[PDB]
Amino acid sequence: SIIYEPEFNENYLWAE
Amino acid sequence: STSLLFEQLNFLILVAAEAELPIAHSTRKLLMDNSCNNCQIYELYNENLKDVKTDKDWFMNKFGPQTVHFVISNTINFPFYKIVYFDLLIPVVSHTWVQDSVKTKRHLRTNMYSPNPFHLLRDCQVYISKSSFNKCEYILYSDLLHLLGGTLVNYISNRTTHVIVQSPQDPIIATVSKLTEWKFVYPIWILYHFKMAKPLKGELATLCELDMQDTSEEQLFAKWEEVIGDKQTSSSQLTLHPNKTLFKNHHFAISPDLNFFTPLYWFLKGFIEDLDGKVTPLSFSDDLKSVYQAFPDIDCYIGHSANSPILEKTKSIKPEIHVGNVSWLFYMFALQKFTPVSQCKLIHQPFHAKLFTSKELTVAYTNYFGSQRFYIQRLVEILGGLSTPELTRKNTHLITKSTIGKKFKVAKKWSLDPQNAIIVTNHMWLEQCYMNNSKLNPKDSRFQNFKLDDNMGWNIGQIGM
Numbered sequence: 186s187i188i189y190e191p192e193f194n195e196n197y198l199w200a201e
Numbered sequence: 202s203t204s205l206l207f208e209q210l211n212f213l214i215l216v217a218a219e220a221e222l223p224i225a226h227s228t229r230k231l232l233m234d235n236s237c238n239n240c241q242i243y244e245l246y247n248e249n250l251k252d253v254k255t256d257k258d259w260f261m262n263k264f265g266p267q268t269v270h271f272v273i274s275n276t277i278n279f280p281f282y283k284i285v286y287f288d289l290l291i292p293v294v295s296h297t298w299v300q301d302s303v304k305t306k307r308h309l310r311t312n313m314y315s316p317n318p319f320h321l322l323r324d325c326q327v328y329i330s331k332s333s334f335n336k337c338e339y340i341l342y343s344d345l346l347h348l349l350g351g352t353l354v355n356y357i358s359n360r361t362t363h364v365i366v367q368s369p370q371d372p373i374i375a376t377v378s379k380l381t382e383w384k385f386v387y388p389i390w391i392l393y394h395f396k397m398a399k400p401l402k403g404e405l406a407t408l409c410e411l412d413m414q415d416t417s418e419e420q421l422f423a424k425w426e427e428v429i430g431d432k433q434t435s436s437s438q439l440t441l442h443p444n445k446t447l448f449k450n451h452h453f454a455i456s457p458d459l460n461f462f463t464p465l466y467w468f469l470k471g472f473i474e475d476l477d478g479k480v481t482p483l484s485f486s487d488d489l490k491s492v493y494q495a496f497p498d499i500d501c502y503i504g505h506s507a508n509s510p511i512l513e514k515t516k517s518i519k520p521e522i523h524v525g526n527v528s529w530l531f532y533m534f535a536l537q538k539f540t541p542v543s544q545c546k547l548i549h550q551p552f553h554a555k556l557f558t559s560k561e562l563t564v565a566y567t568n569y570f571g572s573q574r575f576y577i578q579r580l581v582e583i584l585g586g587l588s589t590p591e592l593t594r595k596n597t598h599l600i601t602k603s604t605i606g607k608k609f610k611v612a613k614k615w616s617l618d619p620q621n622a623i624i625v626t627n628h629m630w631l632e633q634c635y636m637n638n639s640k641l642n643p644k645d646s647r648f649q650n651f652k653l654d655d656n657m658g659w660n661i662g663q664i665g666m
Contacts, residue, residue: 189377190356191331193559193587198336198552199506 204235206306209605209654211239211267215274218246228273228299235303239267245279255281257288261657268657270570273299277317286317287535290662292571293317311571312352319441320350321394325362328354333367337459337505337527338388341469344531345391347575355578356590357383363390367462368421369413385411387421389428392468396429398438425464444537448478451539452496455482456504456511459527473530489514503527507551526551547665548579553638555585561640562586565593566600567608569628569661576662580631598643599625602653602661627653632664 194200212232216225225242232240241264253259260281272285272293285291298314313323329342342365343353354361361383366374374385390409393401401409408424415421453473461469470480481496483489489511493499501523502515515522525542529549533540542549564586566577577600581588589596592608599612615623626643627650634641641648653659 186359188357188359188361188380189373191373194331195558195585196555197331197339198582198585199555200336 202234204303204306206235206303206308207232207237209238209603210270211654212237212241213264213269213272214240214242215272215276215279216242216244216246217274217276217278221275224296228296231299231303241269250280253280255284257284260284260289265657266655268654268660270654271298271311275316283536286572287532288662289657289660290572290576291660292573308570310352312350315350317350318438319348319398321398321400322346322349322351322391325351326354326358326360327351327363327365327391328357328361329365330367330371330373332373333365333371335460338461338465340505341461341465341527342388342391343579344528345395347572348531348535349391349394353575353578354590355588365391366411368418369411369415374411374413387411387424388465389425392429396468397432397436398441422464429464429468442534442537445476447476447534447537447539448473449476450498451500452479452481452498453501453503453530454492454499454515455480456502456506456509457483457485458505458509458511459503469527472534476534483511485511490518493518501525503530504551507553509551512551524551525549544666546576546662547632547635548576548583552583553635556634556638556640557585559585559587561597563589563596564598564600565589565591565596565608565612566628567592567606568602569600573661577628577631580635584631584635594621594623596623599623600628600631601625601651602628604651625649627651628661629653629659629664632661636665 214225214228216222229240229242243264269291272291273296274293275295277293282293286293292311293316294311294314295316298309298311302309312320315323325346327346329339329346331339334342346353357364357377363383364373364385365388366385367387386409390401393405393409405428408428415424466482473480479498481492481499483492493515499519499522502512503525504512505526506512512524516524523542526549529542529545532545532549562581562584564581566574566588569577578588592599592612599608601609603609609625612623612625616625624643626648630641630643630648
């Protein structure tokens with residue numbers, strides 16, 4: 186049972 | 202007192218001394234009474250392995266051809282531990298894991314039953330806050346936590362023990378105070394255990410806790426210097442990682458695409474230098490020809506991205522240069538041998554461009570234990586997708602090694618649906634997608650093979666070595 190689950194960031198691993 | 206709990210799972214029990222046979226026998230009986238497939242016993246004390254090269258080939262020939270799902274040992278002091286644990290990704294668990302697994306009637310998480318005394322965070326379920334860190338910091342902190350035996354989660358739950366944040370400015374602190382136990386800590390909580398190799402206690406433990414009065418960068422730098430700076434008092438457990446010249450005669454160029462919190466860069470620099478390597482940081486403004494001509498011993502490039510222009514220019518000027526990422530360095534530290542990147546795993550190269558989106562790749566997995574959970578989540582991440590703890594209708598794929606278990610049964614039934622069809626495929630689809638940089642078809646026959654436990658070379662992590 187979760188508390189908080191952040192919204193996924195599609196380009197987190199490539200952001201400049 | 203029998204059950205199907207361990208159906209189709211193979212075990213290797215290592216007996217370190219003659220006095221452990223009673224417990225080995227005990228453990229074997231419990232495994233056999235609960236339907237283990239194969240259960241080998243190997244006495245370390247009774248065969249001179251000195252001057253035998255106990256490498257991967259030797260292990261697959263001695264104990265295969267079928268995969269060993271678990272090694273049961275209360276020691277890491279055997280000469281094929283690094284091959285078993287860091288290469289083949291086979292969990293190494295104590296005798297207590299078997300006893301506890303039979304009593305609770307489920308496959309327990311292996312991490313907390315590791316006998317590696319470096320696994321100081323074995324009891325920790327840790328969420329790293331992406332709104333606190335850039336991509337490269339996130340990868341590094343994940344690598345170190347995994348290396349200290351902890352578990353990474355992508356969600357905060359009742360089972361989460363620690364939330365990593367950079368500062369009190371991270372949105373998440375406020376966003377979780379509204380909603381509501383577990384502790385907020387700075388990354389120096391992880392780093393201290395790595396550097397000192399003992400539990401974090403007393404005043405230093407308090408300096409790693411989130412402090413809402415650390416409102417500037419200056420206060421963070423000061424805590425970092427108190428907790429992992431010039432200690433001068435020694436590290437504990439000095440023989441765990443005994444090769445103090447691991448990076449002798451190697452000189453690393455550090456890409457500017459990393460962009461670490463300055464005290465984190467100091468930690469990384471200090472790590473390389475205490476292993477006798479050298480570090481030169483590259484900046485975007487550098488003329489690369491004259492940098493590499495001024496320091497001609499530079500033989501390694503460390504970068505985040507495979508598509509960096511710095512890396513393209515670097516390869517042009519220095520065609521035989523080693524091209525790795527920060528994860529590569531720590532894998533070399535784990536193996537205690539300098540290892541070229543082509544002999545390491547896919548994940549040790551600078552990362553490929555994003556292949557998939559979430560909508561194309563939101564994956565669940567089943568029957569992956571310990572370091573294989575870590576590996577599959579890293580792979581899905583660097584492919585561009587999301588991985589979930591549970592199987593829901595949101596999932597685009599289920600990844601599986603075999604046909605056993607309840608997630609496979611439910612997902613295999615859902616595959617028969619007409620429109621929004623979940624796909625069941627093996628882990629080699631992920632690895633070949635990444636290796637080839639292509640959206641391969643998961644329904645090709647090679648990726649519908651679910652009898653991968655018949656060969657140890659089909660262990661996740663072996664594609665690309």
